[PDB]
Amino acid sequence: MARKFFVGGNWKMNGTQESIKSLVETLNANNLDNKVEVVIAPPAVYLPQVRQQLRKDIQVAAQNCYTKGSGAFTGEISPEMLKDLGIPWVILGHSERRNIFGESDELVAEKVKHALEAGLKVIFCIGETLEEREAGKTTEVVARQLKAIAKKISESDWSKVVIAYEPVWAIGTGKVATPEQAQEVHAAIRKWLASNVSAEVAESTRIIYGGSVNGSNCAELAKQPDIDGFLVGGASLKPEFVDIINAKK
Numbered sequence: 001m002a003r004k005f006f007v008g009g010n011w012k013m014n015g016t017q018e019s020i021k022s023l024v025e026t027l028n029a030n031n032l033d034n035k036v037e038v039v040i041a042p043p044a045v046y047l048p049q050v051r052q053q054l055r056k057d058i059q060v061a062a063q064n065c066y067t068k069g070s071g072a073f074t075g076e077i078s079p080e081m082l083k084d085l086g087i088p089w090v091i092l093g094h095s096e097r098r099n100i101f102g103e104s105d106e107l108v109a110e111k112v113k114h115a116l117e118a119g120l121k122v123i124f125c126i127g128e129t130l131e132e133r134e135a136g137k138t139t140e141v142v143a144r145q146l147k148a149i150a151k152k153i154s155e156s157d158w159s160k161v162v163i164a165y166e167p168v169w170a171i172g173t174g175k176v177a178t179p180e181q182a183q184e185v186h187a188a189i190r191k192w193l194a195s196n197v198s199a200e201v202a203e204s205t206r207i208i209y210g211g212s213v214n215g216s217n218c219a220e221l222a223k224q225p226d227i228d229g230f231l232v233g234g235a236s237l238k239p240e241f242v243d244i245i246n247a248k249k
Contacts, residue, residue, distance in 0.1 A: 010210075
């Protein structure tokens with residue numbers, strides 16, 4: 001089966017009730033390629049508002065959750081709570097959480113495993129730093145970040161995972177990976193899955209690109225054979241998000 005094209009919008013720490021009602025009203029009124037799977041990730045306190053107001057063919061994601069079902073973790077939410085509220089997706093391991101909040105490869109892996117156990121689907125984020133890119137080590141970095149998740153999840157668990165490759169140097173900087181650069185990483189990720197997990201997981205797993213995707217560069221990225229869609233940060237707050245969803249026309 002062809003991999004279903006996937007576009008996620010990560011609003012990060014942005015929004016008010018009124019501004020989010022406007023973002024959702026624009027999504028509700030636009031004609032979206034019905035072959036594309038679309039997921040939107042608002043701040044956690046706006047998850048009820050967005051699930052209520054948003055067209056039901058677009059699913060909602062949280063931007064983070066913790067590793068346990070319940071307990072003495074002031075300020076943390078469990079994937080069980082997300083499932084309970086009808087939020088089917090969670091983004092885990094975004095670079096901002098690996099850096100600012102010090103989430104290690106192993107902590108991300110534990111979050112992915114527990115979210116899957118709790119019944120969620122996961123957008124799992126990986127990607128190399130500017131220095132690692134300049135050192136020519138992107139393939140070894142993504143392999144290391146993938147291996148940590150593979151150590152904690154089963155072959156069958158990958159069916160509810162989407163891999164988001166985001167070069168750290170491309171996140172919010174206006175510097176997008178070229179089609180060649182992104183395609184090479186996605187091919188290496190898929191090859192890693194084939195050798196380390198299974199050929200079936202490699203052929204079925206969506207690998208989406210993120211980092212300065214916009215309405216202009218999205219078409220040629222979407223044409224790359226191992227790029228299955230996008231994780232969109234700043235542009236998901238803009239009307240061009242519709243053009244990115246519609247990148248394959």
